[model samples]
Target chain A: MPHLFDPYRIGNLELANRIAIAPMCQYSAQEGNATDWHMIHLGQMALSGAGLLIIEATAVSPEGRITPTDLGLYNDANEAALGRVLGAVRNHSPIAVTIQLAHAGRKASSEAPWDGGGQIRPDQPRGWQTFAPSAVPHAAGEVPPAALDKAGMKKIRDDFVAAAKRAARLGIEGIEVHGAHGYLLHQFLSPIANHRTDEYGGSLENRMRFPLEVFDAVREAFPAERPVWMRVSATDWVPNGWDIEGTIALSHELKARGSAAVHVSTGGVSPQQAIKIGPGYQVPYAQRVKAEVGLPTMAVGLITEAEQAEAIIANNEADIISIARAMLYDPRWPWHAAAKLGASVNAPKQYWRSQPRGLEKLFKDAHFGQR
Target chain B: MPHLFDPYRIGNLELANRIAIAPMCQYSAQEGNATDWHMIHLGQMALSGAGLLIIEATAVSPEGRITPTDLGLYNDANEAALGRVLGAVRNHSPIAVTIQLAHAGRKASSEAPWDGGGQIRPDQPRGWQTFAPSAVPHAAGEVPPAALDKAGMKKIRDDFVAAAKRAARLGIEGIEVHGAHGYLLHQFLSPIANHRTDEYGGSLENRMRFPLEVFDAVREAFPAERPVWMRVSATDWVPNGWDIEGTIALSHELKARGSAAVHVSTGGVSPQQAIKIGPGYQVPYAQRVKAEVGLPTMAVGLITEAEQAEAIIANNEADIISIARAMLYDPRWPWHAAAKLGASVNAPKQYWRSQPRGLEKLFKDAHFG
Candidate 1:
């Protein structure tokens, strides 16, 4: 098999390739529903020829969205809107589609990137009272999110299950639980974001308890044939914060519960986390998780080149390659990568003539109307 | 010899296929310069596996942009910004890239669609002193644009040359002069927009003179090796205005000037114009141009299905199929169409494994390690 073009599996989920287009926030949704913008954005990604196209972070509750425009699955309108977008995209491509279920927690009530991406007060029309495992603010000089009571935790967890059922009904192939990027589950895991005496916090086991519960709830709610995965921040990149050790422990715990995969990313938990940004910087963390936790891993972070992505899979550094910004920059990043690696990609017959010279055979079994 | 996948020539420019991604506006630039958004937008389009990807309507001058944010090529910053984006996109895809050079004219100083799409007043910061063949407002009660004097006309024509040169320097293979959609040249062609009594208006020949002059000037300034095509509105869709006859005359005029091609479209001249929009609504116009005027034509509008796109080429209705909203709606429209028609598209090897069952032989020479 072409090293980069290798097929892989997670439980019964037969992924055609090891490349994954990571879930990326477009911040172009309307209210909480997917709009025509989603049709344009998601449709392009599906056609990128990637093995899997994970939908962006989807809020489990109204207060769960990071911004008012953040995509959600908490209501019928949200569900129906996403259904329309998915129906249109799925009909066109064979790419396996997945959605990331999340709750923003303390980072809720914020603006989109182009709109400054800062926190907004609850008094504002677009803002709302945020939720977290503790009464703590993510940044300095900010209103602390209201401490999530047991009742509140149960409601959020139930909402995730409800959303998963909705996604399954919509014919989505899989669901990725959002336990990374300092979202709700991550808030409970990181001491900087969570400080509670309840069983949901105060100790490593206690912190792991809530996120694990969310995963089990989701895994049980979704269909058995489809795999359920988790995206963990891996490390908070801060002193006395959620670290690699915590991630390793959490990975083992989830693997024991039959998680099909763990996608490794880092540092969205707190402002104090000093991330050392670089190409493939987060690959090592994923490598460790794969080696120690014995779980399928997807490494993401500035993996923009073909050779770099190929080498990662060839070396077994990670089971798969998850790309974000580079994908938005070039939806066909996989196509270019295939060309560089002496491999090939499958596309529609409509573009058969576009095969660059010497790559004539790059297009498979194409036939056009002859005069 | 697959007709739809067949190659076509335009002087020194040899296109791989007859499918063209039409020039559609993004209205997401900054001070006429491209932004990170452009990189993302244009990058995806380039990777669409299409034969050619034409950039959106780009203003030739600061005052020429339909909105303050329309992509431009008038200054160093605009050129450099576009240069960076093109460099990134070109290196990744072999699909040829081109730009549509334009001046919005009386349509200038308007808000983007997301911002209501109404005309901005000259007194406002976003608005400018609009220019046209006459002092006509596109809509009733709207502020009338300043009629172009000889000096103004000269400046606008020169600006087109300057922009074309910039495009050539940026390695842009072709330039499709925007003479459609009620813009500068279209303003001069339509009576609803152009009421000028000078040599630029009154008689059909007079009205045709200015647009032809600008076309000649641009064709001269642009690289001789590269081809220059023009987009004509084909019809204003309103009575007592520019119609199919005027478009035919213009098509012949350009052909006499050795123009490479003509893209056929209709309306956008006035609010009164009634368009009967439907699938392949504009295909008849393009068919007529190619049949009577004997010019290479690119037909656009509502042709969204794979069978529909194929039949257009199979029947020799139009030389090219230029898509807009359908493209944005499905960047891989061509690819999907290819699959439905039992054709194949070229993509990166990284996706070879994505070959669906029964389509296992879909990828050619895919020797994966």
Candidate 2:
């Protein structure tokens, strides 16, 4: 049985270990421009010795950002800034770099966490009229987003393609379309948000059309050698919304479209979700995707402990385990996991002398260029 | 006496505390462009809750970079990249931003510490012929760099001015000239490196000429309201090199030239340094500079622990405490120090709720908007 420390490959990207640093929004960018804060945040995360480092939810267009500070890759400045950051990361570590291209849809335009995370009014600065499948507001009292017409959908699809091309130009190794999180794609998938009578609405296949279209567009635009993954909200956690059965069908379509992996998360579609939060709460969702559809699956949600993550992999519950809050809480979570699992990791030789006592093989391949 | 957590004013740059995060080279740049590594390295340092965080030794000229990857502020591309970073940091916290403007001189064209800290031959890729006050090499068998003539001197001074102006334009809060550590300016100040017999080098007065000139030029070029500090190797730790007396004399010149403060570090002038390697070892150098010259001084080297750093400031050994490796080792060293010494720190609001129990005040004032 392969352990969490074993190598995992998807298209052109390969991680030294099975563990991946999940994309966690820093909300530290400026006008879609990557700042040194990204260097600091992502730089340290690069040294984290994980197999993969997916950047926080990056917007394909200005309207795609969930907050004003969300990272955007739609402009020349974003390209240059992200290029600078990626090169620096590559210089420091061997971690594979990727980004999650997203559009917030009905969930668009909100204040950041510290500012009391709530939907912003269109009249407010940094807030604009959002677009979704139908004229639906994520919440009851919130401002509704305009129903996207065929042109808007085409624009969204083309924007995704342009962003994917930019990601390729920036030399990003992989791409993950943000299809979950009750964001745009998720909004389309869930009947709670998509009330359209057009080809992109009504039946099961109709609701899946736009999201699948985005995936195919991003996949086609991105390098064929580089894997393009998708994070899907497996269940809306509320009845009458997108559920697990619908997600299974969606994963089948994604696999048919040549997806690299399917990251199974849950319930960001609505405020009505009654989540029974627990350790490894969403592992079952990933387990089903891996077991049934036979697609590469990554399980997330409250999977914090080292043993818990290892068991999820060791027991064949999921193909990969993505930990968000756990990673930020301890950037060296993989190093610690490797230590506990009797596996080794490659730490920078600059920090070679700092290894703890007795575990001679805890860190390896550190050849400090001293004669 | 105010503690290490107390605020201090250096010209118009008012720091929230007396602790300064020292600039440490992150030889992870490419052709002088700061990559994501700087963002990560400096970003964490910004959250360190230190009073000030000076960026790593940034080159003022392309040729000034120690390694090809050393951070550069020499051109428009460099300025825009650095600007993006500074804005991100300012967005997250109230930490004041600054950068160490440097010229490695004869010490240029070297590999990074991880790659082996050896001098890269000029014939090698990513290596170019370095310039210094003389044709002398840093090591006996090292490639000898070109000696700077009048034009070279003028160009070096002008580059410093241009870099300082860029820093101002980018909204950097303050500037620190790289005069110490056997860099371009340090080579002129230390007789071991500076073999010039002309007006540039020879006697102590002659040796101090180039560094002081560069300082005066930078001070004038940078905004009058914002302070410009100089980091100086207080002693060579080798006999007859740039010792405490020469440093004190240089400090007098700097003070007379309207300098803000002198960051007192030691023993990078020569490979022959016999460093005693222990805590607060260099505090005495800063003490002498502050006590004797009455110029504000920042003490560095091995002041690792909170109590130790606190004692150095409490006893008036120096006006400020500068930390490098320790901050990288423990990024939240200031928060830990604040906890240890009963001082408070304002961490980024994004991190405010992540504080450990009973230390509710461990991080505060981090409203995201």
Candidate 3:
């Protein structure tokens, strides 16, 4: 069983440790262009000593953004700006960089989460009609979304493939398919949102079909050595919705289709689901999916404490610990965790004097100190 | 049936409407003193036309703050600073001002929520020992809190009384007892935190005894004309912990003891409860306690939309719609809501030209057109 601090290889990407920074939306882009905010935000996480830093959810297409300001890779202009960001991180930090390719579906064209997370409305300037699997609105008062036709579905898949190629060109080591959190793909998979009678909806097989096809297209575009990860909401938290069993099945199919790892997350299908949010609350979902499919998986959501993260790895529950808000709270969380676990981790030369020497001594005393 | 927007008398406080701004920590105070950030943060909400504006969770004692710079009303110097803030809001906006009097309990002396919510060890210059109902720490690595004796409990109660009197002197309309969100009063009410077999714990009656006594002391200090509210965690979200039944019973007890209303909230004891969070998730909890206990209640948590807030009022689920993050997102939410609902509302002179004239025309056509 590999512990959290152990070195691991996902395809050609050699991670020094199993800890990864999970993708979170920054919404600081300007008209789909990456800015200094994007550079500093992602660069800080890379410098924080996480094994991998997955950049905030970047739109596969202009229309796919959660907001107008989300990072994009659909066009050449976007690719150029993204290349600069990726190169900066690679040069400055030891952490590998990944980009999350996402399509917001019905959840698109909305205000930022800090801006109350509602539709900007057609009456508002810069608002566009949202697209989803069904015509149903996400919530009451939200604009009813247009259902994606067969042509639209094909275009979306192509966009993902194009996005993967763009990320590869930018020297990104990984591309994670964001199929979770009520985004375009998860909206189709979840029964609560996917009310279509078409080939892309109704049955479990039909719901998974679109996302799987997109994943296959993306895999074909990327090199076999460069790892491809898929983030999925393991359970939709609604009755008759997506479940852990469906997720396990999906994970097996994704691995067969050449996904290097499965990142497990939960909720965001419906407005109502009793989510008992606690530390390591969603880790069990990641553990179950990994065990059932025998695939590498990353656990996320509220795994704040270092011991809780170490325990997850020590128990063979997950291959990677993907932290978000925890890392946001402390950019040097991995440095602190390394000291607590008595593991040798690379630290910036400037901060060497401030490093906990006592813990470092304990690590040296232990037989398995340095990698 | 009374809808949420329907105005009703709660003690002597006359609210224009039922929308209340829930106490949210700004974490921008300086040396337990209110600054321009405090003024703009609370003042903007008052200008947004909330019926009540409860300033961020304020400490009743210096050591009672969650962060070093948490808003305090413990001393005359602090009270004077708060009076300036209260006066600014009173002059500029037509909203009742209230302060949430709190002691951080075992969770005291911590960094801000934005700073990962960790304990500030006693070794730190500003850090002090925390007081709890028992000597146990909140969680692993947390400092073991000082157990409050009989004299200590009395002193805390007196501190609250003094704070309430100071708030009245500052020209504030009401004072809410912060018994919710796992604060000191809640630590006494909750079995998960309060393990004491003394009068402060053990039985439900014993647990309810201290907070009720403290409320009595507060009521004695403040004027009879001023309303007193008790904010409580309607459910602890822990198994066999503080549940809705206990909350309803407590609300009834509070009402009898002269608590004008019970502000219902949830969670913050143990982080393990499967709390299915969504918009209006805690509204049902508030509705249950309000209906059962017959005390006015306020609902909060993830209430983000005008329609959702309006429905909470329209359905009679809660007496007041208390929003935190939503208000933070848009300080002009109430003004937007008023326009959306076509309700009459006072707009600032600077923004009067933006006001909808259709409602004015309709009102005139119906009466003297």
Q: Which candidate is the best by TM-score?
A: 2
Residue-level lDDT for B230 in candidate 3: 93
Number of clashing residue pairs in every model? 19, 9, 5
TM-score of each: 0.57, 0.74, 0.50
Model 1 chain A: ten consecutive residues of lowest lDDT: A269-278
lDDT per residue for candidate 2 within B83-149, as digits (tens), equals 7777777766788888899999999888887678788888997788899999998889888999998
Between candidates 1 and 3, the lDDT winner: 1
- Per-residue lDDT value at B309 in model 2: 94
Report the candidate with higher DockQ, 2 versus 3.
2
Question: Which 10 consecutive positions of candidate 1 chain B have the poorest summed lDDT?
Answer: B347-356
Compose the digit string of candidate 3's lDDT tens values, residues A44-161.
5676767888888999888899997788988888988878667756554677888899999999998775456668775688688888999988898788889999889889999999
lDDT by residue (tens digit), candidate 1, B1-369 = 337667776668877677889987777688999865566567667656677888989998988888877899999999999998888676556788888999999888888754666888999988888899999888889888899999999999999999999999999999899999989899999989888877889889999999999999989999888989899999998999999999999999999997899999998888888889878999999999989888788899887777898899888898888887667645666666666777666543334444444665444444433
lDDT over C-alpha atoms for residue A233 of model 3: 87
lDDT by residue for model 2 (A1-371), tens: 95788898877677888787788877778889987667777877788778888888999898888999989999999989899888878777888898999999988888889888898889997898899999979889999999999999999999999999999999999898998888999889989999999899889999999999999999999989999989998797689998999989999999999999998884342112322443333366677788899888877645556777787788787777777766664566777788788888877655554445445666777545521
DockQ of each: 0.03, 0.27, 0.01
Per-residue lDDT tens digits for candidate 3, residues B1-369, read 554445556678888677788887766677788764455455556666667788888898987888887899898788888887677566556787888998888888887654556788888886788999988887766778999998889889989988988888888888899998888988889898889987779999999988898889998899988999899998888898888987988898998988999898988776666687877889999989878887878889888777888888778788888887666544556665665665544433323323334545211112211
Q: Considering every candidate listed, which one attains the maximal lDDT? A: 2
Question: For residue A146, what is the lDDT in candidate 2?
Answer: 97
